[PDB]
RNA sequence: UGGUUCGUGGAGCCAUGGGGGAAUCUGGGCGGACCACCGCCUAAGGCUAAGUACUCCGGGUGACCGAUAGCGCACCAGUAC
RNA sequence: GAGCUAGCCCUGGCCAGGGUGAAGCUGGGGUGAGACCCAGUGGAGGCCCGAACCGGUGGGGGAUGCAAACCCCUCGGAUGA
RNA sequence: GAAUGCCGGCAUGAGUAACGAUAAAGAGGGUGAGAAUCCCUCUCGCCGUAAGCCCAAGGGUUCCUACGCAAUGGUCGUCAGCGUAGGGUUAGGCGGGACCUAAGGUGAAGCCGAAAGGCGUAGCCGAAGGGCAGCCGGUUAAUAUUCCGGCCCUUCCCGCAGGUGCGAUGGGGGGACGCUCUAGGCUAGGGGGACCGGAGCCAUGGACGAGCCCGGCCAGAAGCGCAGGGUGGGAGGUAGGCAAAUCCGCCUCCCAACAAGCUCUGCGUGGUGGGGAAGCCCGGGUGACAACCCCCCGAAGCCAGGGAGCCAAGAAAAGCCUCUAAGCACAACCUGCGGGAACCCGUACCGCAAACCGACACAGGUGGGCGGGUGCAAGAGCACUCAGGCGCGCGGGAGAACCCUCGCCAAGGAACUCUGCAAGUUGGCCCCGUAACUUCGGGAGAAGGGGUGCUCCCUGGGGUGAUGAGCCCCGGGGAGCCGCAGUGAACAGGCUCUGGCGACUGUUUACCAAAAACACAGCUCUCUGCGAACUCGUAAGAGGAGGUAUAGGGAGCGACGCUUGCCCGGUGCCGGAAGGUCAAGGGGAGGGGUGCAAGCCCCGAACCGAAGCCCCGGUGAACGGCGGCCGUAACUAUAACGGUCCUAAGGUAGCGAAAUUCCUUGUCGGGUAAGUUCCGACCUGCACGAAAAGCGUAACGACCGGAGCGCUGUCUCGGCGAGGGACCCGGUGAAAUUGAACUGGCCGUGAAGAUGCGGCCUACCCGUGGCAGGACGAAAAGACCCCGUGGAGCUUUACUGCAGCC
RNA sequence: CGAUGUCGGCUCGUCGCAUCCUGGGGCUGAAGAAGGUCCCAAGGGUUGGGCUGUUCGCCCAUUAAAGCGGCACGCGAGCUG
RNA sequence: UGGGAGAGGGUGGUGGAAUUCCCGGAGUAGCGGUGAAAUGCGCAGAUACCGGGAGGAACGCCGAUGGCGAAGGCAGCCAC
RNA sequence: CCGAGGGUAGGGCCCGUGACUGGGGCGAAGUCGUAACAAGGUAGCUGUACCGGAAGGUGCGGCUGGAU
């Protein structure tokens, strides 16, 4: 439940910051937790590869397990719920009956003090890892594999996920969270339920020192610069596009898709997404 | 006002030193001209 | 595609990035598309003095300069700055 | 050539003093339970005033200058992009 | 002899400007050939969150002493950061290295690239971050946590004693972390004392005083005391920590819990070792057997890894501890003690500046720490002052214009002017009081007013301490005194109304633009299923992202409110397994050359044959576009209505003489005595209009218009006064410019604006202070403009290529 | 064009006369007063404000009157911008 | 106290008919629509027929002149 | 001391008046259409919403004051 606040400064009118109300521990784990190098958008070469990007708070990597497959049949418990700046979900802490402690991300309804486990065996409850050949048709699921044993790849974003639709030989089909239906190979683990932090979108930064905060700098238009920068550089005071909207480097940004023809995944797509 | 040279040894010694320019082909080509031509001196001398 | 005087030209010759791909003298290449005839030569392995080029250096010599000239420097100059 | 300048990365440091008084908490009132109301406490903020610090609004001087961008008065920001 | 030629020399301007902050000087006595300028004394003034002191960088002998004055020093010079010579920098503990890792750099393995080279895990390097043992005083002309004195401590080697499964680059613990606010107790620092120590002082009317003036400490091991940090103990199980493991991690049991206990710091005390003022006398010595005590204020520093709240969620690695593996248990490590061993480099001096960056002894620039006192509400603000440090390396006079900075002004009060530009006004605190409108926060310091000093009297609460006295912090009430005036000096808002633009705090053309421009939260379109799209790269490889559609790229719009209409014919993009055209290739009708002939060789029709393009549709918060003429109502006027032509469709809502309106100062209303501007309206909108968004909007603005009040030297209209210049004398002494000059006015003339030609008029020779009409004055081979088959940036359905993609 | 700075304002004048006022005249459809028109005359004078960058012009209140032009659209080594 | 009828209300689940879209098959010259038409759709293979998949909304017969509620109103079926 | 009142500054209510603008009433014989009354030729009315020269039209739900 997104928190607001009075509109004791300008900013203050629209910020709305996350609840937190469903964490449970407010520092990470030390063991599990490296720097994360800050790149500024900045490659090997040091050039500039992503514009707009640095300056934002200084973050720990949690590390987390994207696997499950680890630790087939060996429960663990749900100690506690966490804070993650990497990422838009909250993480779950798990303490296995191992002595192993590790990070995944936390789904919707998961409740510190139970149990959680992995395998083709587990049951079909909010948590659990298993295969997807094994989960029942029309599950909601998320931290889904995209090839096996490879790691999960689809539907970890703050609230997003995956429905079961139908069985096919070796391959289960997955509506993703964008819509789009897709062939998943059955021996591919993924978690039941939905990601948590639903409620993600409806944040308002309120502020341009919030998007700061994040490591995002602003963002200049093209329009707005001078034709050696950009299609739409220049005139004599504002002017329209003047020419088919266009990207600094020349491409056009309105509709021209840009998936590659030949992929070989192409087999595998069904249905391309919606709205 | 604040103006171009603020000396600083160890930045001398690091961007003009012997040891930079002959890690590098065009370093090494420096020196070649700088002896050819009999320059007392081949870099820029920092105290450290 | 490059080389050649040869800029696609009637375009051979030599070299080769790609594709197809032999034979051992009754084998093979060339004589400017191509064919016959007549000739020339023996590819896909290597080495080979001398005659040729240059002047950091040394000497010899000038219808070469003579301190604003002659080398940037006749002098503690690739210096001082 | 990034010892000026621009952006980023790593690691440190700095921001006198004063004013306003958000949420929350406590108590009180209210109600079926509430919302909510008052007082108290609380000390939030690209909040307010103002040095250091960062600026460079208006005007005057300077104009072979003290200075190849300075000086005086005045003015903006000053816990934050 | 000319090239704004090149190099050099010397002129002119000229004894001219200037001599570098308006913080400021005067005298006496020395020294010397020579003194405003050097040394000494006294007086005066300036800085004192510095203009004082300590670090770091940078500089590199500039430090100290003797001896000098040619040059350097903006004058002088006997002086000096100058010349010569001699001297001077002392560490196991300070900083760096023989330790650690961060970005980054490098790089066995590996990957890539015509060459040169590019990557790259580990590992190595890399600091102002982690880690690690020294404090007080004395001493030199010049070094000191370095030498010396006192008291402390670290590491390595070796031996002794006691103890223990010892053993590590391996496992684990720890190291280990943000922002804001903040408790308790301390310390640094400061204030006061009628108490303690002290050379003296009694002035000029009074005072021999509970008088004046000065000072009243600093460091210290073990131990003790106070205040804090850190930390559960035992057992059983175990499959996890890439071997093992008694360690860690998980589960269970018992016991302990705001504690205690153990351990680690800070502060205090502490054997001992030091310091010790004014004044007097020549840095010394006395003071002195110096005293070394009580009260208070009190940190932003200390205990620290303390506490609370918050979201944007806050390095690594070593030291250190613990676990075991090889090994080895004659070892080895742990603890206590003892002796011995302990290397390399820096250390001078300047360091907000005359020694660093600016060509200069340059009003500029330069990171960290200390920064005393009193009063002003506070403070690092302001004024004055302590310690300390300076009077800025040309002076002496004069008392013109004029210039700069400053002060005052009769009456008027914006009449000034593009504009109240500038300068006034206002100005701190406490109290009373405070509007439209509003997003309920605000608007607000709204506006407007009252108070403010000193004396005596009475009293309320807090802190320390003890509840008391003393000290100290907040108040309340009453009676009076003085002046023109009590934030009596210094620092310290003028206000209001109404438009345009931009929501807002921010950002920008370093050095003519700070804005309405950029950004911004939010809104929409669009691409991307992960070896993602996209971006840099030949590649490898990287960023994206150790992210995964609530995510990531690209585009426009730009808080919020209410809204965002019609056109898909053209261009773009999206979809379309048909049809049309389409290259290499396949195919081989049929021709051709040559040979005696098999053959060799060359051209070649149909037909099969990709993307692209055509064609068929979709699509506007994709590129874009949104009509013309004529007629019509029972006064007239105007047309709700109709006719027709064309379009892909003819501009909806809202707004409109506008940051847009040409005619234009449109017309009417407001405001003024008067209003090309301003506000409100009308609508024939030359030429608004809906995300190059339309119309509004509280709050915000060094933005840009209009009006009023207050107050003014802006003005009528000017006067006077101050200082720094200008002027005069002594010292030092530039500059651009310059064909040569013996260089007047008029009316003409001349290449059309003449000191220089003609005619006439005027005029003795040379300066000094001033003013700017001329020398088509200086400066810059016109930026405007044209020209050159000159150049560069930029655009596109110009041409032709290339990357890239298909 | 190897530079003649370009509107307006302010400041400071100065000249012309086709005279706006003041002086002297003739004619008048001049009774007087007040005008109209032309002649002579350049000695002196020729206001303060509102609007706009403005020149010009309109307006307000006055006046004897609120003149027209030249001097590089007089005057930026005099100022403004 | 013991009983009862009820589409009374809220929550979580869940079943079948039908329409539309997608996929495969099979099949061809029209379908749709109306008063009559036409726009539209269809040889780029529609309509009609079969199989499969996805998704949403409303619940046929029971059903009544019926029941429930203070009114607005409440209709597949299950449980709380 | 109080004090008629004068002065300055800021509020509240009321009344008059205002370029222009909004609808309203009324007005012997204007223009345009024909929405309602019959099933008024699409039954009507309704609350709301959107649209259009105008009456109105359409959507969604409701009423009979609806006709056969
Ligand atoms: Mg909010
Ligand atoms: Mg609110
Ligand atoms: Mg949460
Ligand atoms: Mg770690
Ligand atoms: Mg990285
Ligand atoms: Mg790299
Ligand atoms: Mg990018
Ligand atoms: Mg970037
Ligand atoms: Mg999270
Ligand atoms: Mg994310
Ligand atoms: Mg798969
Ligand atoms: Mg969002
Ligand atoms: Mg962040
Ligand atoms: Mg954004
Ligand atoms: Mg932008
Ligand atoms: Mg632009
Ligand atoms: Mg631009
Ligand atoms: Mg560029
Ligand atoms: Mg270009
Ligand atoms: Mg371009
Ligand atoms: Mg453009
Ligand atoms: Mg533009
Ligand atoms: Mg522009
Ligand atoms: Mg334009
Ligand atoms: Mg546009
Ligand atoms: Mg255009
Ligand atoms: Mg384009
Ligand atoms: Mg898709
Ligand atoms: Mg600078
Ligand atoms: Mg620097
Ligand atoms: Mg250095
Ligand atoms: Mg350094
Ligand atoms: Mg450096
Ligand atoms: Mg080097
Ligand atoms: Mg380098
Ligand atoms: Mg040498
Ligand atoms: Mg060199
Ligand atoms: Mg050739
Ligand atoms: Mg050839
Ligand atoms: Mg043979
Ligand atoms: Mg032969
Ligand atoms: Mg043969
Ligand atoms: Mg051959
Ligand atoms: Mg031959
Ligand atoms: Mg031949
Ligand atoms: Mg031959
Ligand atoms: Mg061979
Ligand atoms: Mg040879
Ligand atoms: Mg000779
Ligand atoms: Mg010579
Ligand atoms: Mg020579
Ligand atoms: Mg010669
Ligand atoms: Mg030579
Ligand atoms: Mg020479
Ligand atoms: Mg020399
Ligand atoms: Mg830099
Ligand atoms: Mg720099
Ligand atoms: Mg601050
Ligand atoms: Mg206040
Ligand atoms: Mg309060
Ligand atoms: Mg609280
Ligand atoms: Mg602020
Ligand atoms: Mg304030
Ligand atoms: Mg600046
Ligand atoms: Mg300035
Ligand atoms: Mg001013
Ligand atoms: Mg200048
Ligand atoms: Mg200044
Ligand atoms: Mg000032
Ligand atoms: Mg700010
Ligand atoms: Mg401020
Ligand atoms: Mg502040
Ligand atoms: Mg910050
Ligand atoms: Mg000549
Ligand atoms: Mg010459
Ligand atoms: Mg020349
Ligand atoms: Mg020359
Ligand atoms: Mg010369
Ligand atoms: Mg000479
Ligand atoms: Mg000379
Ligand atoms: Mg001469
Ligand atoms: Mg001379
Ligand atoms: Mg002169
Ligand atoms: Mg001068
Ligand atoms: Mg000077
Ligand atoms: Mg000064
Ligand atoms: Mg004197
Ligand atoms: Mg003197
Ligand atoms: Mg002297
Ligand atoms: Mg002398
Ligand atoms: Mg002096
Ligand atoms: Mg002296
Ligand atoms: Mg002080
Ligand atoms: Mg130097
Ligand atoms: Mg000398
Ligand atoms: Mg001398
Ligand atoms: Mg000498
Ligand atoms: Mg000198
Ligand atoms: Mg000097
Ligand atoms: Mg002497
Ligand atoms: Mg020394
Ligand atoms: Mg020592
Ligand atoms: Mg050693
Ligand atoms: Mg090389
Ligand atoms: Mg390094
Ligand atoms: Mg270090
Ligand atoms: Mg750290
Ligand atoms: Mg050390
Ligand atoms: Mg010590
Ligand atoms: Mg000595
Ligand atoms: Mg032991
Ligand atoms: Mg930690
Ligand atoms: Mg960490
Ligand atoms: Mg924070
Ligand atoms: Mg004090
Ligand atoms: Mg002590
Ligand atoms: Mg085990
Ligand atoms: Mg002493
Ligand atoms: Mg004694
Ligand atoms: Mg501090
Ligand atoms: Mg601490
Ligand atoms: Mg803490
Ligand atoms: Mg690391
Ligand atoms: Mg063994
Ligand atoms: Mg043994
Ligand atoms: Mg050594
Ligand atoms: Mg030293
Ligand atoms: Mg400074
Ligand atoms: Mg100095
Ligand atoms: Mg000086
Ligand atoms: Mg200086
Ligand atoms: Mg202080
Ligand atoms: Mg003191
Ligand atoms: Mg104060
Ligand atoms: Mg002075
Ligand atoms: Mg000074
Ligand atoms: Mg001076
Ligand atoms: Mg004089
Ligand atoms: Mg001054
Ligand atoms: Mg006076
Ligand atoms: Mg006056
Ligand atoms: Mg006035
Ligand atoms: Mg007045
Ligand atoms: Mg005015
Ligand atoms: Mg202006
Ligand atoms: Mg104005
Ligand atoms: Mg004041
Ligand atoms: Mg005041
Ligand atoms: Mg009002
Ligand atoms: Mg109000
Ligand atoms: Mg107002
Ligand atoms: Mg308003
Ligand atoms: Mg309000
Ligand atoms: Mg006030
Ligand atoms: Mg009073
Ligand atoms: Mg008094
Ligand atoms: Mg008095
Ligand atoms: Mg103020
Ligand atoms: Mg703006
Ligand atoms: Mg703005
Ligand atoms: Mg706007
Ligand atoms: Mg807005
Ligand atoms: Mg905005
Ligand atoms: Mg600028
Ligand atoms: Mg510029
Ligand atoms: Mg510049
Ligand atoms: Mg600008
Ligand atoms: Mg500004
Ligand atoms: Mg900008
Ligand atoms: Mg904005
Ligand atoms: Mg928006
Ligand atoms: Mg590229
Ligand atoms: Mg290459
Ligand atoms: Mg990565
Ligand atoms: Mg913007
Ligand atoms: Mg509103
Ligand atoms: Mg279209
Ligand atoms: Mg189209
Ligand atoms: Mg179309
Ligand atoms: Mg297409
Ligand atoms: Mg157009
Ligand atoms: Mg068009
Ligand atoms: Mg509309
Ligand atoms: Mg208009
Ligand atoms: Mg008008
Ligand atoms: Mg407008
Ligand atoms: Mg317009
Ligand atoms: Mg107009
Ligand atoms: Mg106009
Ligand atoms: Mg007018
Ligand atoms: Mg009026
Ligand atoms: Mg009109
Ligand atoms: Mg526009
Ligand atoms: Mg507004
Ligand atoms: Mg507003
Ligand atoms: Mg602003
Ligand atoms: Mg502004
Ligand atoms: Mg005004
Ligand atoms: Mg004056
Ligand atoms: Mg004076
Ligand atoms: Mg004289
Ligand atoms: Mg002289
Ligand atoms: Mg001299
Ligand atoms: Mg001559
Ligand atoms: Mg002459
Ligand atoms: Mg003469
Ligand atoms: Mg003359
Ligand atoms: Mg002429
Ligand atoms: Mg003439
Ligand atoms: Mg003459
Ligand atoms: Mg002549
Ligand atoms: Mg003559
Ligand atoms: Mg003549
Ligand atoms: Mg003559
Ligand atoms: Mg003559
Ligand atoms: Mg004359
Ligand atoms: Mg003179
Ligand atoms: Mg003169
Ligand atoms: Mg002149
Ligand atoms: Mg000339
Ligand atoms: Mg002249
Ligand atoms: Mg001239
Ligand atoms: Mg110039
Ligand atoms: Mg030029
Ligand atoms: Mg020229
Ligand atoms: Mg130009
Ligand atoms: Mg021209
Ligand atoms: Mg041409
Ligand atoms: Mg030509
Ligand atoms: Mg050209
Ligand atoms: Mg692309
Ligand atoms: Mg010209
Ligand atoms: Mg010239
Ligand atoms: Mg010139
Ligand atoms: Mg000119
Ligand atoms: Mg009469
Ligand atoms: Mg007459
Ligand atoms: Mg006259
Ligand atoms: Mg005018
Ligand atoms: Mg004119
Ligand atoms: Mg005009
Ligand atoms: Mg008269
Ligand atoms: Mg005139
Ligand atoms: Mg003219
Ligand atoms: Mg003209
Ligand atoms: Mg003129
Ligand atoms: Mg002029
Ligand atoms: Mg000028
Ligand atoms: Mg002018
Ligand atoms: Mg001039
Ligand atoms: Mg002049
Ligand atoms: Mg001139
Ligand atoms: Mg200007
Ligand atoms: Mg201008
Ligand atoms: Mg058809
Ligand atoms: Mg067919
Ligand atoms: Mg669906
Ligand atoms: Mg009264
Ligand atoms: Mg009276
Ligand atoms: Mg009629
Ligand atoms: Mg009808
Ligand atoms: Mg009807
Ligand atoms: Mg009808
Ligand atoms: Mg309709």
């Not at chain 1, 490296?34 to 973050?59: A, C, D, E, S, W």
Request: contains cysteine; aromatic residues 6%; hydrophobic residues 35%.
């Amino acid at each position: 439940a997104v928190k607001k606040f009075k509109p004791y400064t300008p900013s203050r009118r629209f910020m709305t910051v996350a609840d937190f109300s469903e964490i449970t521990k407010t520092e990470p784990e030390k063991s599990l937790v490296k720097p994360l190098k800050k790149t500024g958008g900045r490659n090997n070469q040091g050039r500039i590869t992503v514009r707009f990007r640095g300056g934002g708070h200084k973050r720990l990597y949690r590390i987390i397990d994207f696997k499950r497959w680890d630790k087939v049949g060996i429960p663990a418990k749900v100690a506690a719920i966490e804070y993650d700046p990497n990422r838009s979900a909250r993480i779950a802490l798990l303490h296995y009956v191992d002595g192993e402690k590790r990070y995944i991300i936390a789904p919707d309804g998961l409740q510190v003090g139970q149990q959680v486990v992995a395998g083709p065996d587990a049951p079909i409850q909010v948590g659990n890892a298993l295969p997807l050949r094994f989960i029942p048709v029309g599950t909601v699921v998320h931290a889904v594999e995209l090839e096996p044993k490879k790691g999960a790849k689809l539907a970890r974003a703050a609230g997003t996920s995956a429905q079961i639709q139908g069985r096919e030989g070796d391959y289960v089909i997955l509506r993703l969270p964008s819509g789009e239906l897709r062939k998943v190979h059955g021996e591919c683990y993924a978690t039941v339920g939905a990601v948590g932090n639903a409620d993600h979108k409806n944040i308002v930064l309120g502020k341009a020192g919030r998007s700061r905060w994040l490591g995002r700098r602003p963002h200049v238009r093209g329009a707005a610069m001078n034709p050696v920068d950009h299609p739409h550089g220049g005139g004599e005071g504002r002017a329209p596009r003047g020419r088919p909207p266009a990207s600094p480097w020349g491409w056009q940004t309105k509709g021209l898709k840009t998936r590659k023809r030949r992929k070989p995944s192409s087999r595998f797509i069904i249905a391309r997404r919606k709205k | 006002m604040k103006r171009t040279w603020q000396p600083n040894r160890r930045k001398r010694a690091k961007t003009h030193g012997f040891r930079a320019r002959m890690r590098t082909p065009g370093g090494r080509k420096v020196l070649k001209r700088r002896r050819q031509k009999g320059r007392w001196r081949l870099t820029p001398a920092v105290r450290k």
